[PDB]
Design a protein around this nucleic acid. Structure first.
Ligand SMILES: [Cl-]
Ligand SMILES: [Cl-]
Ligand SMILES: [Cl-]
Ligand SMILES: [Cl-]
Ligand SMILES: [Cl-]
Ligand SMILES: [Cl-]
Ligand SMILES: [Cl-]
Ligand SMILES: [Cl-]
Ligand SMILES: [Mg+2]
Ligand SMILES: [Mg+2]
Ligand SMILES: [Mg+2]
Ligand SMILES: [Mg+2]
Ligand SMILES: [Mg+2]
Ligand SMILES: [Mg+2]
Ligand SMILES: [Mg+2]
Ligand SMILES: [Mg+2]
Ligand SMILES: [Mg+2]
Ligand SMILES: [Mg+2]
Ligand SMILES: [Mg+2]
Ligand SMILES: [Mg+2]
Ligand SMILES: [Mg+2]
Ligand SMILES: [Mg+2]
Ligand SMILES: [Mg+2]
Ligand SMILES: [Mg+2]
Ligand SMILES: [Mg+2]
Ligand SMILES: [Mg+2]
Ligand SMILES: [Mg+2]
Ligand SMILES: [Mg+2]
Ligand SMILES: [Mg+2]
Ligand SMILES: [Mg+2]
Ligand SMILES: [Mg+2]
Ligand SMILES: [Mg+2]
Ligand SMILES: [Mg+2]
Ligand SMILES: [Mg+2]
Ligand SMILES: [Mg+2]
Ligand SMILES: [Mg+2]
Ligand SMILES: [Mg+2]
Ligand SMILES: [Mg+2]
Ligand SMILES: [Mg+2]
Ligand SMILES: [Mg+2]
Ligand SMILES: [Mg+2]
Ligand SMILES: [Mg+2]
Ligand SMILES: [Mg+2]
Ligand SMILES: [Mg+2]
Ligand SMILES: [Mg+2]
Ligand SMILES: [Mg+2]
Ligand SMILES: [Mg+2]
Ligand SMILES: [Mg+2]
Ligand SMILES: [Mg+2]
Ligand SMILES: [Mg+2]
Ligand SMILES: [Mg+2]
Ligand SMILES: [Mg+2]
Ligand SMILES: [Mg+2]
Ligand SMILES: [Mg+2]
Ligand SMILES: [Mg+2]
Ligand SMILES: [Mg+2]
Ligand SMILES: [Mg+2]
Ligand SMILES: [Mg+2]
Ligand SMILES: [Mg+2]
Ligand SMILES: [Mg+2]
Ligand SMILES: [Mg+2]
Ligand SMILES: [Mg+2]
Ligand SMILES: [Mg+2]
Ligand SMILES: [Mg+2]
Ligand SMILES: [Mg+2]
Ligand SMILES: [Mg+2]
Ligand SMILES: [Mg+2]
Ligand SMILES: [Mg+2]
Ligand SMILES: [Mg+2]
Ligand SMILES: [Mg+2]
Ligand SMILES: [Mg+2]
Ligand SMILES: [Mg+2]
Ligand SMILES: [Mg+2]
Ligand SMILES: [Mg+2]
Lengths: 124, 189, 103, 136
RNA sequence: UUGACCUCAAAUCAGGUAGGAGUACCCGCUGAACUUAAGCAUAUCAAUAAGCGGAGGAAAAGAAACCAACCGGGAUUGCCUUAGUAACGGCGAGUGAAGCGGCAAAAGCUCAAAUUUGAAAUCUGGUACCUUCGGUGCCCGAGUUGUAAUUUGGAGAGGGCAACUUUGGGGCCGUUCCUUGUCUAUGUUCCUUGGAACAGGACGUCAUAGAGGGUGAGAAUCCCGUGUGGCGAGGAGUGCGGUUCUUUGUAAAGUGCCUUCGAAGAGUCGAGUUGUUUGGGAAUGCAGCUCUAAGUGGGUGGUAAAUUCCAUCUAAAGCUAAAUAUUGGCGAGAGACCGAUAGCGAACAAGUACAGUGAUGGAAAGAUGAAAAGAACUUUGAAAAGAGAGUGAAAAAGUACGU
RNA sequence: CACGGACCAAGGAGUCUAACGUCUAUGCGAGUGUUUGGGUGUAAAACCCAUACGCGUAAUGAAAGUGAACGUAGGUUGGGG
RNA sequence: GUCGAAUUUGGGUAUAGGGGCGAAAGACUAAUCGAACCAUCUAGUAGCUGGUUCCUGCCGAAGUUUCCCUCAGGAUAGCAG
RNA sequence: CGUGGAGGUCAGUGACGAAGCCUAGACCGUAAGGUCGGGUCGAACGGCCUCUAGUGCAGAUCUUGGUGGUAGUAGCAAAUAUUCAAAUGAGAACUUUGAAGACUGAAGUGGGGAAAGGUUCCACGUCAACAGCAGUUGGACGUGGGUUAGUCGAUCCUAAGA
RNA sequence: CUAUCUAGCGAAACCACAGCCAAGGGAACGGGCUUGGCAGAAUCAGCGGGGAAAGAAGACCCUGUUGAGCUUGACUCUAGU
RNA sequence: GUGGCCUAUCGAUCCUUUAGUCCCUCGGAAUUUGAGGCUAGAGGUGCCAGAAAAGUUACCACAGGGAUAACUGGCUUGUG
């Protein structure tokens, strides 16, 4: 239960804050959980999604398909996987928007800042 | 407009009264605010007791003169009899009122005793600043309460001199009523 | 806004209602009729050890409650959660559930 | 003199009790009018007090005392830098001077029950309905 | 002639300051009528709306020319009460306070009037330098038609005698407060339905976390958060918890006794009259005009006057936190409130479109689907489109779209 | 041969408040009223509390004022039980 | 009808609501004039006209008395629950 | 009896279809109403004990919105007037060209301006709506182009006046 | 030139429900009620007897303890003088 | 015998005034004026249960009224 006077349980306020969240805040909202292999290796539970991450789909009709993230569409609260698309009747192909909470990260894109984030969260 | 057997009513609502309606929705909120304000004031004033010592005085008017209550402050004479100056008394936690005067020995003696007991029950920290840490008592009124003075013993012997209390009251009224006319007749003779 | 919202109740009559409520907790038929699952509880009122006041963890508190016969009442609360049936859902009253034991 | 009511040709358009034009009196004294006009003339200053000097059949004469709140001899003086507070801007306009408080009826005792704490403030308190959560 | 003084001017002179906006609440001025009285003029509506001037985060009020008649109380403000009472009123309709008592909050004060007269001891500005919300030196100026020290009625001052008691001004480190960042649990394991499991069933885990929101349908355990704690970053205020640098100072303050004194506010109080206002009634306050004081005096003591007493304060000069107010502004938390003809006029490119010369007036209008996957291609027609095909869980969802 | 009504959908009119009369229910009872305020709290809830104040327990006079038992708190007639 | 004049007319300018302007009709003052238009006081008052939203059950009226600037309204007694 | 919302309870119903809507189909109640089947539909909702109100419509020349009969009806008749052929086009009484017949008749239906409007000017493309028939045309729709000053005006002066 | 007929285009007033009479009674002049006469789809151009036809909460008259313009030694006041 | 042989011959509140009682109050305490109360009359409301009140509208307004007049119709038939 809520114990702080600075936080609110109002449904109207929470939904408004979600749909008007700026770009920087939407990055935290678009977090994905790591795989059991990576969870044991790094010791952390979940991370914000990044463009060069390999993912596995664990929900929906695309379950079981892997790939690498091609775009993080923050405006639409979705990500796109390079090899997960849909063919139209005219022959063209369009990417399918997926929510990161329905994905599992299998390989991470590592740079100086990503490593610092893992260490900041208690990882190794 | 006037019908049936009903009392005459006087409800003063012929002005724009709805523009001046005050509902105390914040009764609970103000109680929290006052309690918060008292708590933060106690922490600000060190171990000081959050209130000043007050004297005991007789309430005016014949209706309320049977009781004693708390007055604004001790008189200059009461402070002097306690053995200190008015200026130092103010800085030590004692309220001083310069416009009240002493005419009753019972009230004067009681307030002198209150000042003496107060001085023996407080500790005054030196100006050097070592400041030993003592527990804060939040009230001086509770520490030094006001009690109604004793009046008579529980039981006593009956002493009747044969006079009548009703007769005494009647004669007292008669003397006051005719005092002016009796003096004029005596003076004219 | 100056409609009357709160109601005065005599202090003594208020304590009369409280005392009647306490005495009603000792009647098994009344407790069962109120929807509580106390069918196989040995004795009403149920009195437990004083060391219950020193339990720090939810896990051991639940185990203690189940060990004295309150397991069925706990399961009633969990399985009774429902969505509210009107406009109160978007007025911060979205879910309803039954009442469990009072400790 | 008096304050003639500024209505066209003396017509008031109302009930007879409000039909008077000539024998009406201004509620503020002529001394108050003197301070206010001086205050507008020198708006960079603060009015402190004023006093009577002379009078003829047509005019009354007054001298008004003014203090400059910007001058360093005032701002650095402990006995007078209270006037530099923004709460004291245009004291004469709000009747906060000595003559203003007299016309406002700001005095102690039973003779000033209507105006002791402010006439309009007192009227609001006496004409307010007070309702509590648990109705008395 | 020359040099001052007084008064009055000038300068794109050196440095400053005022205006306008907002106005919920606050301090004043000015000021109605509809209405009620079953008509109506006094009255009532109302010392209200409209109009005008002036402030702040509160304003205003405030340390008694008070209340009282008691064994007296003791600045102001607010709440409970006094009380629909005393009183006012074509004594009709109606109107209507205050002292005491309980409580919230508590805080006190300073000028004028005295010869520093063995020393204007005071201050703006300029300039140079410096530890720059200021300091020091020097030089003009202000000022004796009175700038400092000293004293505000509770007192207090000038002399004489005898005594002890107590310090001031800065650094730095922490604390208090506010503005912020970061870290800190537990399943997406099997079966069925479905386009989608967040549904049902079985078996587990965490819980000081089963508030709330999101994610393809009701998700504590998928994501953000929630609960409990830890670790940082930047400022304000000297409130104070420790340390450290300066002796301020033949400085300052308090207390006993003797003696001599003890300055206290004027066209003001008060009085007559006129108008207005008040519960204030031979007149409550305010204002105009006329008259105009006193110093053992003066004001008040709710019925006018003469005479004699008593009680109580000290006007005509000034400052001051908290308890109180707040349909405005900024930041938050909520509801037995409304659910698109409701709720603000406005859930939308709403004070918008549009109307009026102008002041002003002022709408209508929310919902495809989880995802455009928004219908390739064939065929008829000049075309719009039609008929097939196709997408979708559903075209009995086709941008004239939920039902 | 009086007035409103061409048709349909949605909206559309004895409410709340201050002070009171009668009646009824409830608590306590010569008393009664915790909620101005204080304490406390799982925090606009619940729980606890001092002093006052309101009404009642005395009336009657314009007022100064005075103030309710000769008696099984009376006698007589009718009265349920 | 009148048509060289007390003529007709453009533009500039002045007069503003109990006010203006009028060779005078109570005419004209932005389709508004025996007192313009706009907003507010204002949800102004009405003894007068209209309307006033579900069912069943039981009881069931009055247009009469007295007073009122009372005669289309009230008070009062009666009838009713 | 029925409606919006609130406390409690039925460990109530539901994507294997909740609510709503349609149904000369069935059942219960004197009635207010309640219940069931079928169709349509897609996400919430009900019974009982109590609490609460912005709680029930046929009317108010009621409010807002929508829709009829009238009715393919009244009517689309002032300003003398049109006709033939070709071109263009899916389509021509109305567009373009040619020919013919007419009118305004210089106080004009001609040629320029002051106010006022504001791109209506010009070209190309182009016809859903608008031009009370029509339309290939247009002051319509879409996309672009266009207003050149020492001498013309403003600017300067003063008028009633402000 | 309309009306009239055709192609195209296409409103409004008004509307309780409607539309054959005689007498009767009736709110004292019925389309409906009572008794009789009667009575056969769908229609076009005309027509002004009726629908007490439509257009407006009668401007006349009275009532209201509703107004306004104007007048006067009505009651009560007022600018100016 | 508590006015006229009997049945009519008359008047609230507020205010003023008179008589009576010389009584009660002016609220810090007294004396004397003055004022205010208690009881009983008078000054009057004839619209007589008791507002203080001139006209006009043919420039007109509003709420209503067939409770109510100016046409027909209906009843009546004095009059014709
Ligand atoms: Cl549910
Ligand atoms: Cl008087
Ligand atoms: Cl808004
Ligand atoms: Cl307009
Ligand atoms: Cl008496
Ligand atoms: Cl104007
Ligand atoms: Cl039924
Ligand atoms: Cl024919
Ligand atoms: Mg009680
Ligand atoms: Mg529903
Ligand atoms: Mg300069
Ligand atoms: Mg004010
Ligand atoms: Mg009236
Ligand atoms: Mg009336
Ligand atoms: Mg009138
Ligand atoms: Mg105003
Ligand atoms: Mg400000
Ligand atoms: Mg404050
Ligand atoms: Mg202030
Ligand atoms: Mg003083
Ligand atoms: Mg006081
Ligand atoms: Mg008043
Ligand atoms: Mg005035
Ligand atoms: Mg009087
Ligand atoms: Mg008097
Ligand atoms: Mg002040
Ligand atoms: Mg709306
Ligand atoms: Mg969708
Ligand atoms: Mg479907
Ligand atoms: Mg009618
Ligand atoms: Mg009609
Ligand atoms: Mg409805
Ligand atoms: Mg309704
Ligand atoms: Mg009611
Ligand atoms: Mg002319
Ligand atoms: Mg005329
Ligand atoms: Mg109304
Ligand atoms: Mg109205
Ligand atoms: Mg019957
Ligand atoms: Mg009627
Ligand atoms: Mg269904
Ligand atoms: Mg049907
Ligand atoms: Mg859906
Ligand atoms: Mg309603
Ligand atoms: Mg309807
Ligand atoms: Mg009806
Ligand atoms: Mg209608
Ligand atoms: Mg025609
Ligand atoms: Mg035709
Ligand atoms: Mg025609
Ligand atoms: Mg023609
Ligand atoms: Mg011709
Ligand atoms: Mg010709
Ligand atoms: Mg063109
Ligand atoms: Mg056309
Ligand atoms: Mg066409
Ligand atoms: Mg265009
Ligand atoms: Mg017939
Ligand atoms: Mg007949
Ligand atoms: Mg008919
Ligand atoms: Mg018939
Ligand atoms: Mg028949
Ligand atoms: Mg005809
Ligand atoms: Mg006809
Ligand atoms: Mg009418
Ligand atoms: Mg009319
Ligand atoms: Mg009448
Ligand atoms: Mg009139
Ligand atoms: Mg005789
Ligand atoms: Mg007196
Ligand atoms: Mg009469
Ligand atoms: Mg009269
Ligand atoms: Mg009649
Ligand atoms: Mg005859």
């Amino acid at each position: 239960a809520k114990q702080s006077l600075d936080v609110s349980s109002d449904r109207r306020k929470a939904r408004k804050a979600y749909f008007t969240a700026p770009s920087s805040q939407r990055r935290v909202l678009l977090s994905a959980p790591l795989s059991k292999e990576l969870r044991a290796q790094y010791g952390i539970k979940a991370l914000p999604i990044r463009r060069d991450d390999e993912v596995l789909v664990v929900r929906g009709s695309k379950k079981g398909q892997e790939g690498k993230i091609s775009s993080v569409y923050r405006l639409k609260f979705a990500v796109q996987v390079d090899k997960v698309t849909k063919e139209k009747v005219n022959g063209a192909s369009v990417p399918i928007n997926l929510h990161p909470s329905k994905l599992v990260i299998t390989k991470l894109h590592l740079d100086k800042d990503r490593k610092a984030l893992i260490q900041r969260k208690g990882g190794k | 407009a006037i019908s049936k057997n009903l009392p005459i009513l006087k409800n003063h609502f012929r002005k724009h009264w709805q523009e001046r309606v005050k509902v105390h929705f914040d009764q609970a909120g103000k109680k929290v605010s006052r309690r918060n304000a008292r708590a933060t004031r106690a922490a600000k004033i060190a171990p000081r007791p959050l209130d000043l010592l007050r004297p005991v005085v007789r309430a005016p008017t014949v209706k309320y003169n049977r009781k004693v209550r708390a007055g604004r402050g001790f008189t200059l004479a009461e402070v002097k009899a306690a053995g200190l100056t008015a200026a130092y008394a103010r800085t030590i936690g004692i309220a001083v009122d310069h416009r009240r005067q002493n005419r009753n020995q019972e009230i004067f003696d009681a307030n002198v005793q209150r000042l003496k007991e107060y001085q023996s029950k407080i500790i005054v920290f030196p100006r050097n600043g070592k400041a030993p840490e003592a527990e804060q008592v939040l009230s001086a009124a509770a520490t030094f309460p006001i009690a109604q003075p004793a009046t008579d013993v529980e039981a006593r012997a009956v002493q009747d001199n044969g006079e009548s209390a009703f007769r005494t009251l009647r004669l007292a009224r008669s003397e006051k009523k005719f005092r002016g006319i009796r003096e004029k007749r005596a003076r004219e003779k | 806004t100056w409609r009357k919202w709160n109601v005065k109740v005599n202090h003594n009559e208020k304590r009369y209602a409280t005392a009647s409520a306490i005495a009603a907790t000792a009647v098994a038929s009344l407790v069962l009729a109120r929807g509580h699952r106390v069918e196989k509880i040995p004795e009403i009122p149920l009195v437990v050890s004083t060391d219950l006041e020193s339990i720090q963890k939810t896990k051991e508190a639940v185990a203690a409650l189940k060990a004295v016969g309150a397991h069925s009442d706990l399961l009633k609360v969990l399985k009774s959660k429902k969505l509210r049936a009107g406009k109160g859902k978007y007025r911060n009253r979205r879910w309803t559930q039954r009442r469990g034991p009072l400790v | 003199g008096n304050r003639k009511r500024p209505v066209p040709k003396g017509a008031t358009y109302g009930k007879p009790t409000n039909q008077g034009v000539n024998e009406l009196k201004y509620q503020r004294s002529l001394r108050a009018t003197a301070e206010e006009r001086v205050g507008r003339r020198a708006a960079n200053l603060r009015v402190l007090n004023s006093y009577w000097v002379n009078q003829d059949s047509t005019y009354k004469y007054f001298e008004v005392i003014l203090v400059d709140p910007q001058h360093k001899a005032i701002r650095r003086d402990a006995r007078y830098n209270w006037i530099c507070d923004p709460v004291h801007k245009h004291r004469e306009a709000r009747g906060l001077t000595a003559t203003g408080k007299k016309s406002r009826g700001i005095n102690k005792g039973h003779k000033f029950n209507n105006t002791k704490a402010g006439r309009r403030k007192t009227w609001k308190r006496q004409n307010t309905l007070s309702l509590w959560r648990y109705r008395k």
